[model samples]
Target: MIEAILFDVDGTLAETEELHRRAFNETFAALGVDWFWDREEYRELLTTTGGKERIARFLRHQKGDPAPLPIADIHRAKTERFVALMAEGEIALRPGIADLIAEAKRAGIRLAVATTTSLPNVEALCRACFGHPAREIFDVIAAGDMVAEKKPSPDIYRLALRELDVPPERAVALEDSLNGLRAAKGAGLRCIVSPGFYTRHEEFAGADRLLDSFAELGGLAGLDL
Candidate 1:
């Protein structure tokens, strides 16, 4: 039986990477940086996870030196822009996501958010999509700030499982990226992958299930939980 469902915030819950990319460029323009991450570049960066960490990595990779860049400030500005964009009410939960969440709630199964995104981003997304804070929807929220390592590492998912007190075997993870799949599997949980725009080209070899969209599951009522 599936006791809990862990959702990844970025591409899984909603297709927000484009907003994130736009926010980064908006921040760059505001901060007077010559950095612009196009779709190709942003897709590569999405593999890294965590806005701050991804920004730092891009700077180091581009500048050949990690010194003297106020990465935290840049990331903070980007986050503000992202949040603002979300507040515009332009995004919504991906197909079948809201229904699945509601179904899980009705079934008395716990829900958790296990993602490398920051808590603010998660909350902003939840508020934008569901008219509630993330904490109000998710029984436990294990974000990047709470974990020493982000996706592609099991720390975040493990933390969520710990907080929910749900064994990995008793929970399932819904993810959109290969890194997230790795993270979920690393923690011994079955992961279902529904590739999003930025991650569709990447391979998801170890995923327990691969889907074009969660609609395929009919709100997970058809899942063999």
Candidate 2:
């Protein structure tokens, strides 16, 4: 039986990658860099986990011959802009997400967040999407900075599972990306994939199930949890 549900932030909780892409472009412009990630380019870059690491990958693969760029500063600025943009209240929770959360609460099921995004990004998302802080929603929040490695590594999911004291077998992960699916599977948890705007093109294999939208599950009532 599933005693807890683990949620991935970026795409799983909501389709916020577009905002992230916007933030990156704005940051690049503000930093006096000619770099810009159009939709297709940003979609490909989403394969990388961390913001700084994604910048480094772009430098090596896209820029070629790898120029020295202040990746840390760029990511820091991007995060700030992303958070600020979130305050615009443009993001919304995915369909059926609020209903599922309410149902889970009524059923006394535990809730957790296992995300590759930073704590501040999660907080910003929570504030914009849920009208509350991260801690007020998730019982256990294992963000990217809390773990040594990010998604596709199982570290973040494992951290959340440990913190919740919930066995992997008794938890189901709601994921949007292939990397998040792999992370949940590596942690021995069942995962349901709902492709987001940025990850819809990715090949999602090994997921326990795929959901076109959370509404497809009808609040998880028939999942035998």
Candidate 3:
């Protein structure tokens, strides 16, 4: 029986990945760095797990960038800026998020978040989507900074299961990217993918289900245990 549902934040619940990309590009530009990630390139970069790590990977591939440490530090600073942007109402939840969440709450199913986003990013989404007392809607929040390893590695999802006290078979995960899908599957959970604008082209072969939006599920009638 499915007892809980875990959601990926960026493209799953909130539409902030593009905001994050813009923030990173703006930060790099203001810092006199010539690095810029076009939308397609940024989408490709989404294959990487964590935000900082993604920036680091991109910098490492650059021709004349500073050493990795400095680049990482810059990315960390960019993350701070991104958080502020998110708090300024630059982000919002994706389609069907509120409805699905409300349905899940009324059904007494536990709700958790598993994502390769920082804690502040997660909190900002919660606040933006659920308002002031965001913690009330979620039972666990496993974020990027909380794990030593990131998605496609299963650590974050594993931590969420441990914290929520729910087994893989009794839970379903909603993901928007291939990395998120792989992460959920790696943790032995059934995955339902709702690919976003940036990830609609990515492969979702291993997912147990795939849909354009949660509204297609028709109020969780078939999602219950």
Candidate 4:
């Protein structure tokens, strides 16, 4: 039986990657950088997981053998604005997320986060969606910086399980991208994928289930445990 349910923040919980895309574009404009990651371009860049890593990769394509971009500060600014956007109604939880979390809680299933996003981003996202006691809802928060490696590496998921004191067979992970699916699967956990707009066209090679959204799953009541 599944005793735990871990969620990926960016897409699985909410289609906030687009919010991230917009924030990045706005960050670019504010920084006077001549880059714009339109929908198509950003969709392609979703191949890379982290925001700072994404910025470096994007600039690499344009600059070729360019010098190190001052991306550290640039990303900090983006995070600031993105947090504000999340605080406002511009970013909201994916349909059924609140319902699902509540369902999991009612069922006595542990709730956790396994993500590659920064801690601050996760805090803001959860606060915006779940409100004041946001951070308390999750039993474990295995996010960026906690794991030295990014998704598709399984470090974060492995860490989450370690903290939750749960076995892989007793937990299920919800993901929205191939990298996230791979990460969960790599950690020996079953996975359910709900592809977001940026990732809908991608393939999920080893997911237990692939969905456009949880709306198609009829809710988590009958989920694999």
User: What's the C-alpha lDDT at position 123 in model 2?
Assistant: 97
lDDT score at residue 88, model 4, on the 0-100 scale = 85
Residue lDDT tens for model 1, 114-214: 98987889989999999998888999989967988888999999999999998888899999999999999999999999998888898999888899889
- Is 1 or 4 the stronger prediction by TM-score? 1
| Poorly placed runs, candidate 2 (over 4 Å) | 64-69
C-alpha lDDT of all candidate models, in order? 0.87, 0.86, 0.82, 0.84
- For 1-225, candidate 2 gives per-residue lDDT tens digits of 569999998887888898999999888877776788899888888888988879888887675333335778778889999999999998999997888888898889999999888789999999989999988899998986788788889999989999999898888999999999999999999898889788888888887778899878766654454
Clashing pairs in 2: none
Tens digit of per-residue lDDT, candidate 4, span 1-225: 579999998887888887898889898888776778888888888888888888888877775333334788888889998888888866777887888888888888898899988788888987877885446889899887787789989999999999999999988998999999999999998998888788878899988988767766666754674
Which segments of candidate 3 are over 4 A away from where they belong? 67-69
Ranking by TM-score: 1, 2, 4, 3
**CA RMSD of all predictions:** 1.8, 1.8, 1.8, 2.0
Model 3 lDDT tens row, 1-225: 468999988888877888898888888877876778899888778888787788778876778656435756787778888878877875767778889888888888999988888887778777776785447778898887788989888889999999999898999898888888888999999888888888888889977778888667667665654
Clashing pairs in 3: none
